[PDB]
């Protein structure tokens, strides 16, 4: 299967209640392995997966140092963004940043990414070539001018094609039992009357990993996508994921309806039936 390493950063200003709250997390695929919280007592980058705990003191020290440097850089960003947008001191605002890399089945580099948002909206993103910038409004054009003059793309590119992939492979190796696994969904459908003339059909997928899955309802082979309630894929808390899709059907037409489950752990996609 293909793999990814991504780091996620959130900084939130807090007018007159001290400094911005900064939270960082790192993931390999859908498995979190580090956190930093600016409000916690430890002030340390902390392990959140068992296979990261073996990393020695240099690692923890280096990641604590770098994570703090990411935090200070976001504190500055919040100030700068309030000036670009002519915003007052009176309101809380949010900067988010995400970066990392994807590798293919052969663990070779596929793609790199480095994206910022302000107040929930795209701000600036490194393009696919790792040489250029997409800036989403006029303020972010000011950032693009500054980042081009300072050759920011080049330094990001060297990390994303090089270091990022090297550490992803190392984590994949060390955490092989956890990370190089696929757990196929355990599927079923439930049936419950909502009146004497309608029933809720709900198609379930349980205990699966990774999180990526497609659940779809058909009526006589036709997709029921506008009539389907699809919940967001959710963690079970044990390292696996769950999802369901439901339709409300007239009683008596159950046999017309089929659920269709697609997941990388399934040898073939499954069709579940009421007959």
């Amino acid at each position: 299967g293909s793999h990814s390493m991504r780091y996620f950063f959130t900084s939130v200003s807090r007018p007159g209640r001290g400094e911005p709250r900064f939270i960082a997390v790192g993931y390999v695929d859908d498995t979190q392995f580090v956190r930093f919280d600016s409000d916690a007592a430890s002030q340390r980058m902390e392990p959140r997966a068992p296979w990261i705990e073996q990393e020695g003191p240099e690692y923890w020290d280096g990641e604590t140092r770098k994570v703090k440097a990411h935090s200070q850089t976001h504190r500055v960003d919040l100030g700068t963004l309030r000036g670009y947008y002519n915003q007052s001191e009176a309101g809380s605002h949010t900067v988010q940043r995400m970066y990392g890399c994807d590798v293919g089945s052969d663990w070779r580099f596929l793609r790199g990414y480095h994206q910022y948002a302000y107040d929930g909206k795209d701000y600036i993103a490194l393009k696919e070539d790792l040489r250029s910038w997409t800036a989403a409004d006029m303020a972010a054009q000011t950032t693009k001018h500054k980042w081009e003059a300072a050759h920011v793309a080049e330094q990001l590119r060297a990390y994303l094609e090089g270091t990022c992939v090297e550490w992803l492979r190392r984590y994949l190796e060390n955490g092989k039992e956890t990370l190089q696994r696929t757990d196929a969904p355990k599927t079923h459908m439930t049936h419950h009357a909502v009146s004497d003339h309608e029933a809720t059909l709900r198609c379930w997928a349980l205990s699966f990993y990774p999180a990526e899955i497609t659940l779809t309802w058909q009526r006589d082979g036709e997709d029921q996508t506008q009539d389907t309630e699809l919940v967001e894929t959710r963690p079970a808390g044990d390292g696996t994921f769950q999802k369901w899709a439901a339709v409300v059907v007239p009683s008596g037409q159950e046999q017309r309806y089929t659920c269709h489950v697609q997941h990388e752990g399934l040898p073939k996609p499954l069709t579940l039936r009421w007959e």
Binding site: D77, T80, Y84, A140, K146, W147, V152, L156, Y159
Partner: peptide
């Protein structure tokens, strides 16, 4: 492992 102001 981890790796600029706007």
């Amino acid at each position: 492992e981890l790796a600029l102001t706007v």
